């Protein structure tokens, strides 16, 4: 066929319910993702293939960078719970990977602040039960595929992307066959 088990994508053999349709992990600490976000925009040329009716997910892991990972995973919870992820996600990325900024949980801190979230709303938001349970839902939706690597994206609970069987000659090539993959599997 053209899209074949075990080439652009991967069947998973423990199926995941009530998974979300569209899940992405990444971790700030992870070079491929800031590639991802950065020069590729994957999220948002998969969004623009997709489906009507279609949410998209995105998590960050533990795995990474140790306590300071746990920091990032934290953050993140506080990034979804204020939906502020569209101001943060570039300066954490840079802030880690490229002016290396970013050795504390203040320093992540500092970023939001710089980026316009108020200090008593951003510190009222880490210390909070519903930002507990996001870390939790994190943790648990990673939990649910044993996920090893990132960046990594599921759909529907049953279906890896595989982005090592793609074309990288072309960065625009290869983020549309990443698209069109997902869309595949998502009508699948």
Same mark, same amino acid.
């Given at each position: 066929?053209?899209?074949?088990?075990?080439?652009?994508?991967?069947?998973?053999?423990?199926?995941?319910?009530?998974?979300?349709?569209?899940?992405?992990?990444?971790?700030?600490?992870?070079?491929?993702?800031?590639?991802?976000?950065?020069?590729?925009?994957?999220?948002?040329?998969?969004?623009?293939?997709?489906?009507?009716?279609?949410? %998209?997910?995105?998590?960050?892991?533990?795995? %990474?960078?140790?306590?300071?990972?746990?920091?990032?995973?934290?953050?993140?919870?506080?990034?979804?719970?204020?939906?502020?992820?569209?101001?943060?996600?570039?300066?954490?990325?840079?802030?880690?990977?490229?002016?290396?900024?970013?050795?504390?949980?203040?320093?992540?801190?500092?970023?939001?602040?710089?980026?316009?979230?108020?200090?008593?709303?951003?510190?009222?938001?880490? $210390?909070?039960?519903?930002?507990?349970?996001?870390?939790?839902?994190?943790?648990?939706?990673?939990?649910?595929?044993?996920?090893?690597?990132?960046?990594? %994206?599921?759909? $529907?609970?049953?279906?890896?992307?595989?982005?090592?069987? %793609?074309?990288?000659? $072309?960065?625009?090539?290869?983020?549309?066959?990443?698209?069109?993959?997902?869309?595949?599997?998502?009508?699948?």
């Amino acid at each position: 066929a053209q899209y074949e088990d075990g080439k652009q994508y991967t069947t998973l053999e423990k199926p995941v319910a009530g998974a979300p349709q569209v899940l992405e992990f990444f971790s700030f600490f992870c070079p491929h993702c800031y590639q991802f976000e950065e020069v590729l925009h994957i999220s948002d040329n998969v969004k623009k293939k997709l489906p009507e009716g279609v949410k %998209m997910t995105k998590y960050h892991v533990n795995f %990474m960078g140790g306590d300071l990972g746990k920091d990032l995973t934290q953050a993140w919870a506080v990034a979804m719970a204020l939906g502020v992820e569209d101001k943060v996600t570039v300066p954490l990325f840079e802030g880690v990977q490229k002016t290396q900024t970013i050795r504390s949980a203040s320093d992540i801190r500092d970023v939001f602040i710089n980026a316009g979230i108020k200090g008593e709303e951003y510190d009222a938001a880490w $210390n909070s039960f519903v930002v507990k349970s996001l870390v939790a839902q994190q943790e648990k939706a990673a939990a649910d595929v044993q996920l090893r690597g990132v960046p990594a %994206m599921f759909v $529907n609970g049953k279906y890896q992307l595989n982005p090592q069987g %793609m074309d990288t000659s $072309n960065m625009d090539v290869f983020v549309q066959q990443y698209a069109d993959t997902v869309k595949y599997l998502s009508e699948k």
